[PDB]
Design a protein around this nucleic acid. Structure first.
Lengths: 87, 129, 217, 206, 96, 125
RNA sequence: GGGAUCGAAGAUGAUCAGAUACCGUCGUAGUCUUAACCAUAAACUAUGCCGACUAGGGAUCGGGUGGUGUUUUUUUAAUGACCCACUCGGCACCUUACGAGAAAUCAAAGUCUUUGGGUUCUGGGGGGAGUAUGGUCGCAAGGCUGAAACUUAAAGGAAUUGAC
């Protein structure tokens, strides 16, 4: 949201979920933010560089956050041969 | 028995969006449904979707992104005139800023802002926001 | 001098978080009202109701006091707190505290055009508590707050300038009404609009950038 | 985003077959039939131990993502998991909670049981159910060691194993412990097996 | 679908349903039957005149014990006997 | 009902937990011990403490009563590291170098594409 | 027509306490059929009917498809009967809550202020009153339909505590 001067007029842009793309609100405490560590060639974690995920309280509460995070990881190349798109 | 088909279609779309899913299977299909989903797809409340033939009346598989809040039908298809649009957009939309009451005019089925621009009217099917 | 006990609190004491928009951005549970007091210095409370309730506690007929208190910025940060206590002023103070804890932001927007500051809300919203349902509708500029004076005061403690309201249910019981209006103004940051379809990258928390600080020693 | 260094080891696969980690539960829930390989004719399902291995790999990545190693908490009310969790946290740097979980340990900022994790790891989501429900209020990720009929409410990355056999539990904690330490940098070479035996994490009684 | 017809050629059923269900109101049934024009003592007017026949010491017992000061009147327009209260005069000294 | 007060119980218990071997079965020497080893202002309450030391010393020479002795917690710390068997049940030498496993689990390992020593013992229902 | 049991009425012996009313024995009608009449129930699942979608789980009932399953071995089979896996179509159960509701509770009493799948019927504070009158159906008993005058600030539904 902006004004007629083209400058933004909001308090904060909300975080959206990643499994269902819905808004993670300012008091969803059943939601979860996940960091997965970027690895080295030796298999050491880079300390300050992560890949992040957002799994909302509806997603996590329904009992789906495992499968959905498997999907997101294998689609981002962190898993392989786990999440099958056909069932 | 099964009397309206666009109503059942938007019922299933809305239920699967409420559960947060990604795809739906609509049975049966119609020309009206295809045009409606094209109107949705033009502004992009959905991604791509796909017809399936079985020689009877097709099925549809819809990929739905995350953007749909709610869609629905107005089941008695009311006759509307031009200023009458300003009634229904005052009733169904969540703001004056967005949302699309969709009409069935003689020049095709489309959202209300295009019928403002094309300066036509007709009947009404449903609402998307 | 206030000592924290939570690692959010000693982040706030360290001057490492500036606004609550980080906390609102990261869906964090707050448990220290001193955070709210240090980050909302222009936070102005107002009592809504003080009422004596007669308890029957272990053969003792006694008088306690239910205090329904609203805190609220003149910008969009609202809080509701209901507290029963043995004393009037203790009920006032702890209701203030509970309202400090349950502060939620609001998304006040436009009606029609895009000029100046947002004055009305951005969409329609609805809250429910008990049988009380409160429906908020945007209003044109300078139209005031068409609401009952409890609800009107909870909206004036939000910086909401223009809104139409309609309720349903037994709105006599004013705490259900204030809770339903509070849910309605909390759900405004809960309805996804096409101007927020833009995909954004997930930023990191202050919990890990400042992880070496703010740890329990 | 993974080298072929991370792939499944023949030694580790012999370990996992010896511990009966592949022997899944009798009844399988809806959300974990991806992890099933097949059902034996006696009614026991088979767990894809390669999927299990790569789930441990991703869990070890997540454990590596927490900067200060103290906010990682391991949890067990399971008897064998008490031993496993204690020796895990000994070799790890994480903090253990063996035995009975005190409610209000993650809420209640006043009491002495008040801890502020950034990750919770669970042996049995049915035996440690209240720890899952407690973590569901203060925004904590949950790693669980789920058998094939374990409930998957409020869980993140869940590892398919057998929570019945103590060898399976101790070995799962063992492999997760060593893989985390290899990811840290205290176990610089990957060719090196972890020198402490998996018998230190198995449960004993005189 | 909410137990009522929604077909686009069904205005008749809706308005017959309303004309049947408006007899369950109070003001409608008094109003369209000519109730006030037949049995109400004023005959549907805001005031009336009459001739005092009696002064009455009516009694209100519970929970308020008071001696109500009333007057039995016969109205001029109808020939209708109506009792009525008279306020503020403990003596009824303005009334005979 | 001669219930000992809290001071006599706690003082006598502490004098036996810290200072066990000096104390004896006899009241008259434990009385002089309580005279010399604790600053008890009154003879009477000293006699209370000393006779309760005498009674608890009669009780502890029959068996270990639940006092304080910091000589066993370190042994329990050692007990964690004592029973580390040199051949695990995971070690193949327990089963002659081979993994005795079923047909479907062998099918799993074949699907993994990893070569292990396996003996296929079939089961049925 | 039948009439054995029990038994609205009735005919009767009562009595002893204020332990309540008593009770007990005989017993016509009826209870059972045939030919007709009547059309009412807490005729309740207190939940109209048709149709779609939305979580699991394990039992059953009817049908069907598989099994180098099992057993009765008749020599192998084939029957059957169980076990396993799947599929329809039921009567029920048990969790939760995503959602609903005032709550008890509800996989529908959900997809409802973000209010529209189709359609039938019903209600508008409590009494007066299912009363009065009229019509209609019936031999009768009654059923259906169905008021007003007048009177009144509550009558209610669910849940919660402890004081005779």
């Amino acid at each position: 949201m902006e004004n007629d001067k083209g400058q933004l007029v909001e308090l904060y842009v909300p975080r959206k979920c990643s499994a269902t793309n819905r808004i993670i609100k300012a008091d969803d405490h059943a939601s979860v933010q996940i960091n997965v560590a970027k690895v080295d060639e030796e298999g050491r974690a880079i300390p300050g560089e992560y890949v992040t995920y957002a799994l909302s309280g509806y997603v996590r509460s329904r009992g789906e956050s495992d499968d959905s995070l498997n999907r997101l990881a294998q689609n981002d190349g962190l898993l392989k041969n786990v999440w099958s798109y056909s069932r | 028995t099964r009397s309206s088909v666009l109503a059942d279609a938007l019922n299933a779309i809305n239920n699967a969006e409420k559960t947060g899913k990604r795809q739906v299977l609509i049975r049966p299909s119609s020309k009206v449904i295809i045009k409606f989903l094209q109107v949705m797809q033009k502004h992009g409340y959905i991604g791509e979707f796909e017809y399936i033939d079985d020689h009877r009346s097709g099925k549809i598989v819809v990929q739905l992104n995350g953007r749909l809040n709610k869609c629905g039908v107005i089941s008695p298809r009311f006759n509307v005139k031009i200023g009458d649009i300003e009634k229904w957009t005052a009733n169904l939309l969540p703001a004056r800023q967005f949302g699309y009451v969709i009409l069935t005019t003689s020049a095709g089925i489309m959202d209300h802002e295009e019928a403002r621009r094309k300066h036509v009217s007709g009947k009404i099917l449903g609402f998307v926001y | 001098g206030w000592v924290p006990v939570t690692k959010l609190g000693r982040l706030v004491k360290a001057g490492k978080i500036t606004t609550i928009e980080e906390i609102f951005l990261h869906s964090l549970p707050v448990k220290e009202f001193q955070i709210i007091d240090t980050l909302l210095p222009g936070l102005q409370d107002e009592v809504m109701n003080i009422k004596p309730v007669q308890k029957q506690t272990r053969a003792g007929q006694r008088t306690r006091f239910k205090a329904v208190v609203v805190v609220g910025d003149s910008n969009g940060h609202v809080g509701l707190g209901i507290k029963t206590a043995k004393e009037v002023a203790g009920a006032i103070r702890a209701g203030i505290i509970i309202a400090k804890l349950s502060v939620i932001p609001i998304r006040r927007g436009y009606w029609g055009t895009n000029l100046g500051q947002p004055h009305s809300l951005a969409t329609k919203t609805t809250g429910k508590c008990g049988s009380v349902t409160v429906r908020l509708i945007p209003a044109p500029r300078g139209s005031g707050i068409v609401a009952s004076p409890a609800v009107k005061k909870l909206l004036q403690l939000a910086g909401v300038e223009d809104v139409y309201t309609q309720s349903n249910g037994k709105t006599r019981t004013l705490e259900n009404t204030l809770k339903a209006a509070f849910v309605a103004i909390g759900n405004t940051y809960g309805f996804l609009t096409p101007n927020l379809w833009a995909e954004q990258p997930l930023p990191v928390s202050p919990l890990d950038i400042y992880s070496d600080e703010a740890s329990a020693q | 985003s993974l080298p072929a260094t991370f792939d499944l080891t023949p030694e580790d696969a012999q370990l996992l077959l010896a511990a009966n980690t592949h022997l899944g539960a009798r009844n399988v829930q809806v959300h974990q039939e991806p992890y099933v390989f097949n059902a034996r004719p006696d009614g026991v399902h088979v767990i894809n131990v390669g999927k299990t291995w790569e789930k441990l790999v991703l869990a070890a990545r997540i454990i590596a993502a927490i900067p200060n190693p103290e906010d990682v908490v391991a949890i067990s009310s399971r008897t064998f998991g008490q031993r496993a969790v204690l020796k895990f946290a000994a070799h790890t740097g994480a903090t253990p909670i063996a035995g009975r979980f005190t409610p209000g340990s993650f809420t209640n900022y006043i009491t002495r049981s008040f801890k502020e994790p950034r990750l919770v790891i669970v042996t049995d989501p049915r035996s440690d159910a209240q720890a899952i429900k407690e973590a569901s209020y203060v925004n904590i990720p949950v790693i669980a060691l789920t058998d094939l009929d374990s409930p998957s409410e409020f869980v993140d990355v869940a590892i398919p194993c057998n929570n019945r056999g103590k060898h399976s539990i101790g070995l799962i904690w063992y492999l997760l412990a060593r893989e985390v330490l290899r990811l840290r940098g205290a176990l610089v070479d990957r060719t090196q097996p972890w020198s402490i035996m998996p018998d230190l994490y198995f449960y004993r009684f005189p | 679908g909410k137990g009522k017809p929604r077909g686009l050629n069904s205005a008749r059923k809706l308005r017959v349903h309303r004309r049947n269900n408006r007899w369950a109101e109070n003001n409608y049934k008094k109003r369209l039957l000519g109730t006030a024009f037949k049995s109400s003592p004023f005959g549907g007017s805001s005031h009336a005149k009459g001739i005092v026949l009696e002064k009455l010491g009516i009694e209100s017992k519970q929970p308020n014990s008071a001696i109500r000061k009333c007057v039995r009147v016969q109205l001029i327009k109808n020939g209708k006997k109506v009792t009525a209260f008279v306020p503020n005069d403990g003596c009824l000294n303005f009334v005979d | 009902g001669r219930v000992r007060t809290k001071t006599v119980k706690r003082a006598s218990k502490a004098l036996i937990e810290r200072y066990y071997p000096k104390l004896t079965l006899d009241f008259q020497t434990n009385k002089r011990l309580c005279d010399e080893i604790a600053t008890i202002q009154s003879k009477r309450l000293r006699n209370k403490i000393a006779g309760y030391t005498t009674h608890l010393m009669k009780r502890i020479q029959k068996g270990p009563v639940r006092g304080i002795s910091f000589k066993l917690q370190e042994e329990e710390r050692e007990r964690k590291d004592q029973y580390v068997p040199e051949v695990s049940a995971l070690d193949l030498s327990r089963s002659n170098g081979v993994l005795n496993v079923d047909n479907q689990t062998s099918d799993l390992v074949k699907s993994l594409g990893l070569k292990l020593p396996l003996s296929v013992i079939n089961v049925s229902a």
